[PDB]
Amino acid sequence: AEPNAATNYATEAMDSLKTQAIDLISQTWPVVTTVVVAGLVIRLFKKFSSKAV
Amino acid sequence: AEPNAATNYATEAMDSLKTQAIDLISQTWPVVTTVVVAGLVIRLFKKFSSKAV
Amino acid sequence: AEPNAATNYATEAMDSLKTQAIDLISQTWPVVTTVVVAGLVIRLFKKFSSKAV
Amino acid sequence: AEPNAATNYATEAMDSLKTQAIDLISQTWPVVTTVVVAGLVIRLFKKFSSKAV
Amino acid sequence: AEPNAATNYATEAMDSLKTQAIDLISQTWPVVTTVVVAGLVIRLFKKFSSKAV
Amino acid sequence: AEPNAATNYATEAMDSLKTQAIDLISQTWPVVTTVVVAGLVIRLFKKFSSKAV
Amino acid sequence: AEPNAATNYATEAMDSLKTQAIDLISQTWPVVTTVVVAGLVIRLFKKFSSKAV
Amino acid sequence: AEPNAATNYATEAMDSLKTQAIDLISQTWPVVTTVVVAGLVIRLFKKFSSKAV
Known part of the structure; x- marks a missing residue:
């Protein structure tokens, strides 16, 4: 719930940083x-x- | 009882923070x-x- | 109501700090x-x- | 307003640091x-x- | 009336402390x-x- | 008046700290x-x- | 007792990090x-x- | 007596922290x-x- 939903938003910006890297x-x-x-x-x-030499 | 039940709820959010980390x-x-x-x-x-050099 | 309206003003300065960052x-x-x-x-x-070397 | 005017002064010294770099x-x-x-x-x-060799 | 006029004088020094901060x-x-x-x-x-190295 | 004169003395030592920095x-x-x-x-x-090598 | 049992768990993850390194x-x-x-x-x-040269 | 016996127990956990470090x-x-x-x-x-080069 608390760290699970926080890691859903964090994983979204991490996979956009993987594709753009x-x-x-x-x-x-x-x-x-x-x-x-x-x-x-x-x-x-x-x-x-x-x-030629 | 008092710190035992408090450490049960604290350990629950600590193991969700371990899996999500x-x-x-x-x-x-x-x-x-x-x-x-x-x-x-x-x-x-x-x-x-x-x-080639 | 009380923390809801407080988080409305706090979110306004947080999104202006996101755009300016x-x-x-x-x-x-x-x-x-x-x-x-x-x-x-x-x-x-x-x-x-x-x-040339 | 608050981060907007702060980023106006910060951008001024950032573009003088770009030209001088x-x-x-x-x-x-x-x-x-x-x-x-x-x-x-x-x-x-x-x-x-x-x-000559 | 009583806390309303008290918060008028308090808000005046609070907005002068916002501008000077x-x-x-x-x-x-x-x-x-x-x-x-x-x-x-x-x-x-x-x-x-x-x-040069 | 109150935070205005306080920020006059504070700005004086802040600009001497800018020149000496x-x-x-x-x-x-x-x-x-x-x-x-x-x-x-x-x-x-x-x-x-x-x-020479 | 206190740092002794703490260094037992720490040594376990240190030797798994040695084998996997x-x-x-x-x-x-x-x-x-x-x-x-x-x-x-x-x-x-x-x-x-x-x-051949 | 008072800080002397307190530093006896403190030194015991300090030397177990030295050996385990x-x-x-x-x-x-x-x-x-x-x-x-x-x-x-x-x-x-x-x-x-x-x-070989």
């Missing part, structure tokens, strides 16, 4: 994917210079 | 599991760039 | 967004030096 | 730009020695 | 704003050292 | 500036060793 | 073992390219 | 020892990948 981390994934675009494209250019 | 901490575990989803997925992308 | 935290979000502007711009400069 | 980070950008001047100039000297 | 808390807001000037300026200096 | 935080800024002198000078020495 | 770290070991599977398999591929 | 901290030591088992075993795996 998964959205914020979904903006993190494409940013580190673009950092790996600089790593793979620049390091393939280093393969151009080393292979 | 275990539920609130059960919303905490999947939120830190999603923080470890950003740590393991982003750090495996850092393994992509470092291994 | 959401406004104060809305000034917090763009300040930590500018801290992430220093993290992403400075760390992309560190990607310039490390990629 | 953007100025402090604007001193950070040219310092990491000079660190990339040591990385690109020194690493172009390493390209001089490696290309 | 809002003035005293208005001296509190700029003092905690200057504490946040030390937090944001000093912590932006910590961003200078950590970004 | 700004002076104490002005001793804090040059101390964290010297901590950033150790961070930038020591980390430029780390740029000497890493660039 | 050893289980959580046992999920950590195979995850870093798979990170060493990427290090040894990818770095043996780098031995293929360097040995 | 040393027991609770003795459950703390093996838990941080297992945290150092994850640090030394996982960081020796990082020595496997870095040494």
